Amino acid sequence: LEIDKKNCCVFRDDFIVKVLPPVLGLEFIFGLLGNGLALWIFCFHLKSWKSSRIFLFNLVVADFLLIICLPFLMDNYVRRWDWKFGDIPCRLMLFMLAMNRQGSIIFLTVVAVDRYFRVVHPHHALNKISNRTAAIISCLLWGITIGLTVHLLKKKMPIQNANLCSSFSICHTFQWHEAMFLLEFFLPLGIILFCSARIIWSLRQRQADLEDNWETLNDNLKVIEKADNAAQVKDALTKMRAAALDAQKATPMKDFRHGFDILVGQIDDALKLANEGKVKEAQAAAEQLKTTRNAYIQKYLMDRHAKIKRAITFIMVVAIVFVICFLPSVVVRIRIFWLLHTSGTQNCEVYRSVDLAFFITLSFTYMNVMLDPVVYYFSSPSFPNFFSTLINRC
Ligand SMILES: CCCCCCCC/C=C\CCCCCCCC(=O)OC[C@H](O)CO
């Protein structure tokens, strides 16, 4: 509440002391349960480590850095920022808190960039990265996360004012490091938003092409069944045969590839019956095409339509989690940069309501430990298959 030293106006509303501690606890419970489940599924349930799970497992590592500090953080907010712990416990908590935020920001982009190449550029060299190469990338990206946040271990803590454990970054005017801080968030924000746009755009296109081929197939058969001309059926099978050949090249399955062989072959048989004036004998042969697509095709259409739906769901939650967790604190920090430049630090009451917003959006930053489990769930069908086979045992 009182004006701190070195031109620093800080406020501790009662809403922060009363509402945030139980929020920190809920984020601690679901975060430990979700990441603990992920840690079990990643490391013990499945034995195959792909390049995507290696990049994705870093979020689990980045989340446990915040999970460890959450009980201590609760102890600080209930004590009104009275840091009962020592010097070293405070430096480590600030380091791990920044390591969790900066680490989650970086690896949520790597997850989006990885899925961007799996979808948009399937044949690019970055899709064939070895597990050792992906492990080198993750280590190099952790080394970057170290350097950006290692400075929080140099400053001695706490600071008497009762002792407070905080890196007062909301009392620093906009300078070079603060510009770096904003750029370290907006470049990943631009990459994730662009990748999410391209992936959703490309995947909704593939689904629209599958349903367009399947539409022209069922629709054309209804023409053949309702046909009263011998020439109408010759042209109707033409659009079907072109649709059956387009669907073969679209699929990026052993019993589904040979199903189009039988599908096209049955069209060729009725194609000869259509050219011989067999109006009734070609309309009937076209009904055998209804029994082959149910047994052979419709299953692969639903499997791919679900694979596409889960991929779009995955890239959306990665973008949504990145925004609703890290953007609110950024906007508030930008508003403080303006007020320090506009109003200065003579009258502190200009920062009363803004400080309440900062610690509110600060708990949004801590939400990434209970929302990353949602990212893990939609990453691969192995996660829902873990709980489905676990519930199979009843
Ligand atoms: C930082 C500000 C100044 C610099 C701003 C730079 C902005 C563009 C960056 C990268 C584009 C290239 C990567 C993403 C799109 C290209 C994908 C690619 O490489 O695809 C190749 C090929 O199509 C596969 O088959």
Ligand SMILES: CCCCCCCC/C=C\CCCCCCCC(=O)O
């Ligand atoms: C080299 C250019 C660096 C650009 C950094 C990121 C761009 C956006 C920067 C902040 C936008 C709002 C500015 C914050 C308060 C500015 C007050 C001031 O004039 O000092």
